[PDB]
A paper describes a structure:
Structures of the BQ.1.1, XBB.1 and BN. RBDs bound to the fragment antigen-binding region of the [name] antibody (the parent antibody for sotrovimab) and human [name] explain the preservation of antibody binding through conformational selection, altered [name] recognition and immune evasion. As illustrated by our cryo-EM structures, [name]-induced selection of a structurally frustrated backbone conformation around position F371 and of a subset of amino acid side chain rotamers compatible with Fab binding at position 3395, along with the extensive interactions formed between the [name] H339 side chain and [name] CDRH1 and CDRH3, probably participate in modulating the distinct affinities observed by SPR.
Finally, we determined a cryo-EM structure of the BN. [name] bound to the human [name] ectodomain and the [name] Fab (sotrovimab parent) which resolves the N-acetylglucosamine linked to N354, which is located near—but does not make contact with—the [name] CDRH3. The K356T mutation is likely to abolish a crucial salt bridge formed with [name] heavy chain variable region (Vh) E108 (as resolved in PDB entry 7TN05), as (1) the BN.
Numbering used by the authors:
A (entry chain A): 19 to 133, 141 to 599
B (entry chain E): 334 to 372, 374 to 516, 524 to 526
C (entry chain H): 2 to 125
D (entry chain L): 2 to 104
The structure:
């Protein structure tokens, strides 16, 4: 008879109707991604429109139930989700204009060419695998000046329109809108202000930075062997020489920066081939890994309805390793594997993703997600750390039982990961900090690029090889910017990743250095992780996190400890 | 004459859970041994061992047949609560009978979605044991009448199942036959 | 389970033929009896169905008015009769034990015609 | 409901896979369709019921499935004794048989 009950009833109807419509859309999409043709794209679009129209109508009923006369948090969390208007606050012309801009920007990126070469395959190959200063600079510069340059006029107007809707939904700006994803207000002792994200990110960044400074210095010293006339021993690294188009990852530098290159690293590709492994063996072994720590097996539907192998040249099914959840217990994967270590480890990542999906599957529809945007990848990432551990490879039977793990091998392993983990943190931090200042108009439109360049020099130690005018929009050349995605989840994920691992390694009673940790055959470690996974969004991320790591926030200690054996080694190199 | 149990279990169609089919077995010999020799997915007896039933006589035996999801099978057991136990098929705490269930995904599912099985989602009050309503009258949640129109704060009380061949084990359709013992084995 | 049918008969146009079917190896009143005709060089054509429990029948629209069926529980034998025989009614008439319809409730079952007789040839 | 079978003459060598199709003018339930096998000079026998369920006494050579208006019968490896006439049925409406095919 009151709002509490009326809101409850509304959500019950929503969840069941949404449950089926969602499934139809997801399945139609699944079929399309395995059948790139006209028939399938049409069915996908039709099911998609059915779903979107439903949500638009439901959100106008949710408005009848004010949050302030609702006591139960699990109702407000589900109801608030349906009370957001999004862009449906703007006039018909402003709404249509915003959608036009959004679609135009993504189109230019996807169809962008330089001359002709496309970003992928083409320019990415040049940036990733070529020891040629001038060729690398050309690919870098052409992408920025030919494609990303067309999107500033659109980005400038986009920012204004996005702020109008953020205002309408009671946020200061769109940056504030996004930060709201980390708001846990209403739970005493575990509360978190969305504006608090800035303070905590800066705090943990400065504490990690010392590790980055030694990694950066080491890499710089080593890159100067390939680029002795381009890299200054006391300066910033040129962006185009980082092995990427934007300098997001340093993983492609691990051929110049290798600590002990006189010895081979661990690679079980040949062992898998000699032992007659196949796609089924790769996923079956990954399944056993999860079992050994108390996690459930994959469903029969997973094994039957998934794409684990390449269909061939008859069925044009995109293979893009992705974990799928179509709803209603229908778990699947699209991933065409080969007999190699890279897919061995990937299978653990994607299955780790599914293990999370299977945990919060018991939650109400609108709560069937991670407690935090950075939690889903944090979980998938650690699952693969055990798989890559020499101890695991010896036990599984891919490495000789008499295989010795040398000190030189140890350093080689740690650096390879540091270039994926540590060298990427500054990048995520600088981009989100900049965008936040853009949405929250602290930076004038004409100085958007001035501040952006300054930030990389100060924050990540990377410098642009060329000057740029006010007519450019460098960050718009990045997928996540032109396609309106949040990026900070690539910062918080990493910190959560190591906090969880250390807690799990302690639970497993691991003795010795953290990087040698293998939580296989440890029920206790598995229990700690599961307790966090099953919660979904029913609880604050500040509580879900504590359940495993003993902290009510993100930290840096576990990360610094993981690479401690590398840190001391690096000190003696610098 | 032997009791037509196979006409309950091996029937082509089962009723929906919101309107379950109460089948009466009478004046016949009840052979329950067949039901104890399956590989069925669940077989739960409450107070009536399957190896004892063949030696018992009952005034009547009732077989309630309906289709629900695998995750809802656990609500059939006595003392349980939930969307089925409270609004569709309520079984008493003091229950004497067997609950037999099996996966019917190969029969009761369709690619386009099988929407011939409905369940009740909303109700004004929860059900008593073995009672069911088949009313389709609009459910009012709000403080004002909608006069039968599914408008603001009014809902259609029934929701459909959309059974499909690729659903997970707990979402695939299960054929449930509840044998309530009030016919001699 | 076995079904034993009568031997071949020759009839003149306008005459009737009644074909028996003795059943054994199972509870008679638990399963119905169906009849299927097969003319020379042709496929299978359903004539009708009868329950052994309550005598309920179901006939094909191409035979209604000509075909009748009965059962005798005490001899566990089914019977079918086709009257007003035409020159087009020359065929082998088959008896079968069905699992397609319940004998007690009359509801459709998941099954088919499991046991068949040898077939009775009727010439006309 | 009308049932049509094809091909009429699936004459294949022993040792090879043999498949038959049955199509309906109207949809039928997987609950209601069955396949039969008739040897020369003999009554037909039930092979598959419920679309895919194998009948008692039938070799595992025989398998099948189907829904809606499209059902099939498959013999994994044709044997010398499998050279018979096959029929599809339905009992969703009245009761009918298909034309029949010879393997
Ligand atoms: C619902 O219907 C099924 C199937 O019924 C059969 O098919 C229909 C169309 C009609 O022709 C019926 O007359 C048929 O019976 C019933 O399942 C059958 O139940 C009987 C009796 O319990 C079973 O017979 C036993 O089989 C034992 C051997 O089992 C093993 O070998 C068989 C192959 O031969 C294999 O399929 C099975 O999985 C095992 O590996 C045998 O030891 C025992 O002595 C006896 O002969 C018969 O096998 C069952 N068939 C199937 C497919 O399960 C259901 O009982 C019926 N339900 C109810 C409530 O009656
Ligand atoms: C791919 O889609 C087309 C759509 O016309 C369909 O005909 C084809 O059978 C599909 N392929 C597979 C393997 O399902
Ligand atoms: C909120 O509702 C759930 C039912 O979904 C109930 O279990 C929980 O105890 C309620 N919490 C409060 C504070 O009412
Ligand atoms: C959504 O729009 C409605 C109608 O203008 C308004 O009442 C409601 O407060 C808005 N909600 C949010 C979160 O903006
Ligand atoms: C997974 O299946 C295997 C058998 O293939 C079994 O031994 C193992 O215990 C199962 N693991 C779990 C969690 O059920
Ligand atoms: C429900 O029971 C009635 C008899 O009371 C019967 O006529 C009807 O067909 C049954 N419904 C189903 C789906 O079997």
């Amino acid at each position: 008879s009151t709002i509490e009950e009326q809101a409850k009833t509304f959500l019950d109807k929503f969840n069941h109707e949404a449950e089926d419509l969602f499934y139809q859309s997801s399945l139609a999409s699944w079929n399309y991604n395995t059948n790139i043709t006209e028939e399938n794209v049409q069915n996908m679009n039709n099911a998609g429109d059915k779903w979107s129209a439903f949500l638009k109508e439901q959100s106008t009923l949710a408005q009848m139930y004010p949050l302030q006369e609702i006591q139960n948090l699990t109702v407000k969390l589900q109801l608030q989700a349906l009370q957001q208007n999004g862009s449906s606050v703007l006039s018909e012309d402003k709404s249509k204009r915003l959608n036009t801009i959004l679609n135009t920007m993504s189109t230019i990126y996807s169809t962008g060419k330089v001359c002709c070469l496309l970003l992928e395959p083409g320019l990415n190959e040049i940036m990733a695998n070529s020891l040629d200063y001038n060729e690398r600079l050309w690919a870098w510069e052409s992408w920025r000046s030919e494609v990303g340059k067309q999107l500033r006029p659109l980005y400038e107007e986009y920012v204004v329109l996005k702020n109008e809707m953020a205002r309408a939904n009671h946020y200061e700006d769109y940056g504030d809108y996004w930060r709201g994803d980390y708001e846990v207000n209403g739970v005493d002792g575990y509360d978190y202000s969305r504006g608090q994200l800035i303070e905590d990110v800066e705090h943990t960044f400065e504490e990690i930075k010392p590790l980055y400074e030694h990694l950066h210095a080491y890499v710089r010293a080593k890159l100067m062997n390939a680029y002795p006339s381009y890299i200054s021993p006391i300066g910033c690294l040129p962006a185009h020489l980082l092995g990427d188009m934007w300098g997001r990852f340093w993983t492609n530098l691990y051929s110049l920066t290798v600590p002990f290159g006189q010895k081979p690293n661990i690679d079980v590709t040949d062992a898998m081939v000699d032992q007659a492994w196949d796609a089924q063996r790769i996923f079956k072994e990954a399944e056993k890994f999860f079992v050994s720590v108390g996690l459930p097996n994959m469903t029969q539907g997973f094994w039957e309805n998934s794409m684990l192998t390449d269909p061939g040249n008859v069925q044009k099914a995109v293979c893009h390793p992705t974990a799928w959840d179509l709803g209603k217990g229908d778990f699947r994967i699209l991933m065409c594997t080969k007999v190699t270590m890279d897919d061995f480890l990937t299978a653990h990542h994607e299955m780790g993703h599914i293990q999370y999906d299977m945990a919060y599957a018991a939650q109400p529809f609108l709560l069937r997600n991670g407690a935090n945007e950075g939690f889903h990848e944090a979980v998938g990432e650690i699952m693969s750390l055990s798989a890559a551990t020499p101890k695991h490879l010896k036990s599984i039977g891919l490495l000789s039982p008499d295989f010795q793990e040398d000190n030189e091998t140890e350093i080689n392993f740690l650096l390879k990961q540091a270039l994926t983990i540590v060298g990427t943190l500054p990048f995520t931090y600088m981009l989100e900090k900049w965008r936040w200042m853009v949405f929250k108009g602290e930076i004038p439109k004409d100085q958007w690029m001035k501040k952006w360049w300054e930030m990389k020099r100060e924050i990540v130690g990377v410098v642009e090889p060329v000057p740029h005018d006010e007519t450019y929009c460098d960050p718009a050349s990045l997928f996540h910017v032109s396609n309106d995605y949040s990026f900070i989840r690539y910062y918080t994920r990493t910190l959560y990743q190591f906090q969880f691992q250390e807690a799990l390694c302690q639970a497993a009673k691991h003795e010795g250095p953290l990087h040698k940790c293998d939580i296989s055959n440890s029920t206790e470690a598995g229990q700690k992780l599961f307790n966090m996974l099953r919660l979904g969004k029913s609880e604050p991320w500040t509580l879900a996190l504590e359940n495993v790591v003993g902290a009510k926030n993100m930290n840096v200690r576990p990360l610094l400890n993981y690479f401690e054996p590398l840190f001391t080694w690096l000190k003696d190199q610098n | 004459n032997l009791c037509p149990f196979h006409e309950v279990f091996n029937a082509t169609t089962f009723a929906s859970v919101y309107a379950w089919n109460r089948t009466r077995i009478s004046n016949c010999v009840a052979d329950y041994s067949v039901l104890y020799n399956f590989a069925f997915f669940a077989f739960k007896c409450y107070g009536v061992s399957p190896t004892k039933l063949n030696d018992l006589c009952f005034t009547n035996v009732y077989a309630d047949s309906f289709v629900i999801r695998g995750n809802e099978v656990s609500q059939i057991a006595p003392g349980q609560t939930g969307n089925i136990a409270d609004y569709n098929y309520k079984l008493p705490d003091d229950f004497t009978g067997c609950v037999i269930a099996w996966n019917s995904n190969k029969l009761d599912s369709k690619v386009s979605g099988n929407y011939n099985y409905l369940y009740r989602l909303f109700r004004k009050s929860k059900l008593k044991p073995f009672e069911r309503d088949i009313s389709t009258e609009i459910y009012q949640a709000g403080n004002k009448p909608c006069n039968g129109v599914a408008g603001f704060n009014c809902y259609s009380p029934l929701q459909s199942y959309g059974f499909r061949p690729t659903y997970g084990v707990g979402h695939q359709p299960y054929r449930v036959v509840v044998l309530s013992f009030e016919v001699c084995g | 389970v076995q079904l034993v049918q009568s031997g071949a008969e020759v009839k003149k146009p306008g005459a009737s033929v009644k074909v028996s079917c003795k059943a054994s190896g199972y509870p008679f009143t638990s399963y119905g009896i169906s009849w299927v005709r097969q003319a020379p060089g042709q496929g299978l054509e359903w004539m009708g169905w009868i329950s052994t429990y309550n005598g309920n029948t179901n006939y094909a629209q191409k035979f209604q008015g000509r075909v009748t069926m009965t059962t005798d529980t005490s001899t566990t034998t089914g019977y079918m009769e086709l009257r007003r025989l035409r020159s087009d009614d020359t065929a082998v008439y088959y008896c079968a034990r069905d699992y397609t319809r319940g004998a007690w409730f009359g509801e459709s079952l998941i099954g088919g015609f499991d046991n068949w007789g040898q077939g009775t040839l009727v010439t006309v | 409901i009308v049932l049509t079978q094809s091909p009429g003459t699936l004459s294949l060598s022993p040792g090879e896979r043999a498949t038959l199709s049955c199509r309906a003018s109207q949809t039928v339930s997987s609950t209601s369709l069955a396949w039969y096998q008739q040897k020369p000079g003999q009554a037909p026998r039930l092979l598959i019921y419920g679309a895919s369920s194998r009948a008692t006494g039938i070799p595992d050579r025989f398998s099948g499935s189907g829904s809606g208006t499209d059902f099939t019968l498959t013999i994994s490896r044709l044997e010398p004794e499998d050279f018979a006439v096959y029929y599809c049925q339905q009992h969703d409406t009245s009761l009918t048989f298909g034309g029949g095919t010879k393997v």
